Design a protein around this ligand. Sequence first.
Ligand SMILES: Cc1ncc(COP(=O)(O)O)c(CNc2cc3cn(-c4ccccc4)nc3n(O)c2=O)c1O
Ligand SMILES: Cc1ncc(COP(=O)(O)O)c(CNc2cc3cn(-c4ccccc4)nc3n(O)c2=O)c1O
Lengths: 428, 428
Amino acid sequence: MNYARFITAASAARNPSPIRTMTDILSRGPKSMISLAGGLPNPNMFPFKTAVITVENGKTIQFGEEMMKRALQYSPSAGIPELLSWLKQLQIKLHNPPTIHYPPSQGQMDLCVTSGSQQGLCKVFEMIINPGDNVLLDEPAYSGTLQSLHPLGCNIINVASDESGIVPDSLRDILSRWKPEDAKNPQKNTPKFLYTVPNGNNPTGNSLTSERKKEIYELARKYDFLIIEDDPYYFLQFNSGRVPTFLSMDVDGRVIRADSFSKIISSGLRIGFLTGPKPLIERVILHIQVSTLHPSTFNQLMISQLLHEWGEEGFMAHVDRVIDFYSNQKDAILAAADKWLTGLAEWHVPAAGMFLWIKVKGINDVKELIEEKAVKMGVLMLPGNAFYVDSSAPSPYLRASFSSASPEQMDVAFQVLAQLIKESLLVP
Amino acid sequence: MNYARFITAASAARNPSPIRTMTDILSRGPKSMISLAGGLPNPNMFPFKTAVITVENGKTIQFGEEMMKRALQYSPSAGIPELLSWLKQLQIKLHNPPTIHYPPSQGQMDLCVTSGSQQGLCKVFEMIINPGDNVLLDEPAYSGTLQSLHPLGCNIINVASDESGIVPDSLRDILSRWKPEDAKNPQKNTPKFLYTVPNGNNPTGNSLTSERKKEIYELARKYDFLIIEDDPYYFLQFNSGRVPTFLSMDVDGRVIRADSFSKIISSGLRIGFLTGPKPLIERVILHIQVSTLHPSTFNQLMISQLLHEWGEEGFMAHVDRVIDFYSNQKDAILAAADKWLTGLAEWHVPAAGMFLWIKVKGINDVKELIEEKAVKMGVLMLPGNAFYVDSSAPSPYLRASFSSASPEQMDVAFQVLAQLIKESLLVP
Ligand SMILES: Cc1ncc(COP(=O)(O)O)c(CNc2cc3cn(-c4ccccc4)nc3n(O)c2=O)c1O
Ligand SMILES: Cc1ncc(COP(=O)(O)O)c(CNc2cc3cn(-c4ccccc4)nc3n(O)c2=O)c1O
């Protein structure tokens, strides 16, 4: 593939740090080397000495004197080597990407640890988007993505979707305005990429099927666009097993995948990872180098130590317990919606994640009913407006999270909503 | 001050996330509220339970069950409130900025925690720079800043400098190409900003005097440009007292200051902070919101707990012990250079920081000596090329860090350097 056409002039202009050549020559010189090269501060000046972190339950992560000095010091831009190698093997085990052994220039599978998956996505959007470029996505979409794309000056083209996510026939119809050969044409503006959240879309809770992913991938090949697979709910699917990902079917090296530890390990530690073709991942790493430099070494070492002790089996057993908890939370929110909202609202059973997307029946805009009337009654939900490119347009939808509230709290919240629907209906 | 004229259309287009709006109406409603509006994962699913971190020396930082759940959860984009308030008070005590009580629109002093000071600088450059803009700086300059500015398409104008940093007469001569009234002219390209490292410039080690800062500030007012004060060695000055900063003389609200904890507390934790006018700090926070979201909550809580227990006095006492250690390292590197390099190289005594900037006599380019010959002999130093806009031009300079090597290691390293210089001197 020609990666240069999916890279801005600014992104292509990025050069590596002078410390890259120094690290490459460090592995080509003697063993007992003296370095006065790096701008590394003295680790003995740091006030934190050792650390003990207890793990669920009875287990213990310990940072001795030397490990603590490493944790408090600068580390590689793409992430610590032990976390990268464990994650690489996880990706091979979970997705077996076709690109593992491709030459670097042909999109060889590459990884980098990011400060949450949001950082990876942002660098990816900034690497690709020139003002006026065309991008594809299905609305309602994650507000963070829309807020990230809005300043970039791109035209966002909405792809139709249903309970099984993106409708491939709608994507087929949209793309028919171009001819496949337009992707090679400098005077044509064929879409740079398709962005999607394939499992438990934020805010709908809907997931793509394997069949639909195969059809979407074939259209991405035909019109030569990238697939940005933002999958933070991959490890939060309600069904047993896992639907094959876009990365698993990536024969062309056209998929950039974002994974997150936010919903399973910790959101506050800011650790996620990007998997994709080496020429694109390299552009992202060069941008990280001049911004955050690297993700927290301390946080990476905590997660790396946990993952190595658990192994892939202990990791998957932990995700299984997390899924079990969210599955019960999902049943409790569905039971509250059944009790109070039957006849008043419409909702689908979410396939993954932590949200219930509710459509209020005889109301055009839910914003004032929620942002004002519901708050006064002691209940807060998110109005749907925030999940569309045109956020000023009226929305009868609301997003309700089932991650934290108790069944009794959900019952209170839904009873209130039901009376406010009956209130906004009897108004002349 | 007209802040919109300094920023890009993309930066001005940034909008806040909806989670800020929901928090604004949270305090505006009852106390025992049920909120299904948020997107926070359930914290009880996170595998880390408690933490104990030992501090220098005999002291301990503890994260109980509830504090650990906070540390592992999402937190505000600008930083945790207790770290922000402690940092705000430190800035007032150290710099007493003239803008503390200005209205928000007039550049009221504002702060935000960043994932290292490099993130703050990068967001600041991205917020300001349109291709073709003129920017001022003194070369040799920090490689990270040059590598960051290079993709932005700006014209970098070199300001002459000496052992006391930027020469105000050179800045005066450069600016004379414009008339002060051109700064109000949209069709003129007057400089957007002056960037400088006022204490222990990376790589020279040179520091600006108070008198030079006052003259530079007056030129910044006359031609209406911003001052980007990148000061990571502010807490690493070898001279007695601290030279007043650009922020301390900032009557106009034209200074953006970057501070770093990398050289004093931890480089690996990725915690720094930006201080500047509220309209500009807000644009940076809005960009952080779509990228890293926030700095690690865990890392901020560790630093915040340490700073609150130390107090500002304990913090300043720690910086004194750090300066004392680097002052001794500086004497050891100067003694090693005197012994091995006299007649072979030239160097100035650094005023602050951790680097010795060495000019090799009789050689035009030190790159092959440093990147190949020295590495093979087991010694690493940085060639000077990386500190200039034109990195391909030959450089007789090298940067040697005195932060980590022992006096015995410096002696070995410089004996090797002397040997290689001698070898080069004999080749005709
Ligand atoms: C003027 C100025 N402005 C801002 C900052 C940024 O500081 P933050 O940490 O607060 O973001 C600095 C920090 N400088 C350096 C930081 C460096 C880090 N590595 C390194 C070495 C090995 C592995 C990974 C990284 N090597 C470094 N070298 O060589 C440096 O010079 C600065 O000097
Ligand atoms: C599809 C998709 N893609 C990527 C990501 C990013 O994940 P990372 O953490 O890996 O960067 C998500 C995460 N989503 C959300 C994250 C949220 C964080 N806060 C919050 C709440 C209070 C204080 C501070 C922040 N509120 C949030 N809300 O509302 C969310 O929906 C995602 O859903």
